[PDB]
């Protein structure tokens, strides 16, 4: 029956693990990748503080993912009891450039359905971790909460083989982490109320400084940069930002949708959005 | 640990009780009224299908309410086990005309904090029931779900003593249930991006047809009217509307905030909003 919580005593701080701050890791999943799963299992944030939430599309592809995901969860949750995740929720979804717009709008609904259903009165942090992020440091959560920001996006790169240099290498991958520019605002001012700007919209091109390219091999991993747009690859959100209402709009919101409109929404709710240009995590390879 | 739910198999229908559709009744509460509580207990929707959520402000007034509320919950949850509410969550809040704007914006955060924290992967319906609604029919939930609408506002009146006629009587109370008018849109088109229109804004006056006055003593209780703005007095929402993202904006949203901006948000998410002009429920008396 009865559950009592003072939300003002629920903190999100730099020292999340020591303070026993609960985190909810949310992953929309069209394809199950074992390395994503193994990378998750290698996170060293205490398991008793972690809840997991997944949402799969209602398609042949989603159902194959669901099967593999269910099997992986069964193995972990029936191993030693001290190492179980506190809770795991699996949901199936309720629901050019023009293709991208439609796809992003559909994703916005999936993310909301998952977020609303799973966030609770004890959650301090929500980590948005896409199912194709296959490599992070094992201290990902501690590393990111340390910054104590309302919203914090890691920079998403991708490994590949460099044919010229005959050696493994890395390249930028996620261009949804960006700062707004005057050029970006002007172009948006001139647009109709339901026109959406998404990545690859010709005239803005890369005129909104993309975080991916601020990666500095000579810099340090704690570097922070102010952002205006984020993706959902590996993006850490204080629970209070979502509880105040910031969500993933399926409709045009200042000409933005989904994860980018989310950032704009958190700013309207008086939160600041940041990114880590020199803290890289990795999206699955083209060759994988 | 493990919880599985297909959200597409989670229905909100006309025959909610028979279909065992779970409802979450959400009440922000600054003042505990025994008649509100007794009226809630007299609802005859099955208890095993009801979860309750409350959120109180962090003030002397809220803490007095909290004490009385806790006592009332203890009595009900430790009576016969067959009649317990499935779950009860109590939260304390994390956080002219100009006064109304500030008050409504603060309420929007409270409603979101409560909604996000308490809605779950099994919820079919969310009833927003203000803590000063002290009389409804005992079949309130069945009566309202019967309509099978995305959003449905009951018409909120208030009892008083008629001094002239020397007899109990009734008067309209909630003017946040309205239809938009051309005059309303024109006046809003001419306003700055962060100007808010709230009840009592001089120029719109009552030019947005108010549902309160469409009450027809000669009409029938099943009458439906299309709305554009709602309050949170006694307003029933299919869970999918919230899961898709519709929430209570604390920032100006098409010049609307809180419950009115919520309705506008659900419309942007392609939902239709309705009201019951001849289905009256009652806000506590001035004399009470
Ligand atoms: N629930 C759900 N997840 C999806 C869907 N499409 C892609 N995903 C997941 O959403 C995330 C982003 O995937 P996608 O946009 O295809 O890859 P990207 O373009 O390389 O970021 C990954 O976690 C995918 O598994 C969908 O239709 N529904
Ligand atoms: N959590 C919370 N609830 C409030 C606060 N102020 C009022 N309420 C509740 O919000 C609802 C609307 O109350 P109010 O706006 O004062 O009454 P109205 O103007 O007659 O609708 C009722 O359920 C009140 O108990 C607040 O600051 N925080
Ligand atoms: Mn991908
Ligand atoms: Mn009142």
Numbering used by the authors:
A (entry chain A), B (entry chain A): 95 to 189, 202 to 394
Quote the study that presented this structure, word for word.
The ScMnn9 structure was solved by a 2.2 Å single-wavelength anomalous dispersion (SAD) phasing experiment with a mercury derivative and refined against 2.0 Å synchrotron diffraction data of a mutant (D236N) in the presumed GT-A DxD catalytic motif, in complex with GDP and Mn2+, yielding a final R/Rfree of 0.19/0.24. The structure reveals that ScMnn9, and by extension the entire GT-62 glycosyltransferase family, adopts the GT-A fold as previously proposed by sequence analysis. Seven β-strands form a sheet that is covered on both sides by α-helices. However, ScMnn9 has a unique hairpin loop formed by two additional β-strands (I262-N283). The loop could potentially act as a molecular ruler for the formation of a mannose backbone of defined length or act as a guide to recognize and correctly position protein N-linked glycans for mannosyl transfer. The metal is coordinated by a histidine side chain, a carboxylate and the pyrophosphate moiety of GDP. The carboxylate metal ligand is part of the canonical GT-A fold DxD motif. Both the α- and β-phosphates of the GDP interact with the metal, similar to the RmMGS enzyme. Despite the fact that ScMnn9-D236N was soaked or co-crystallized with GDP-Man, electron density for mannose was not observed. ScMnn9 D236 is the first aspartic acid in the canonical GT-A DxD catalytic motif, and mutation to the isosteric asparagine results in the loss of activity, similar to the previously reported less conservative D236A mutation.
The ScMnn9 glycosyltransferase is essential for the formation of mannosylated proteins that form mannan in the yeast cell wall. The synthesis of mannoproteins starts by the extension of the α-1,6-linked mannose to form a backbone of at least 10 α-1,6-linked mannose residues. This reaction is carried out by the M-Pol I heterodimeric complex, composed of the mannosyltransferases ScMnn9p and ScVan1p. ScMnn9p and ScVan1p belong to the CAZy glycosyltransferase family GT-62. This family contains metal-dependent, retaining mannosyltransferases that are predicted to possess the GT-A fold and use GDP-Man as their donor substrate.
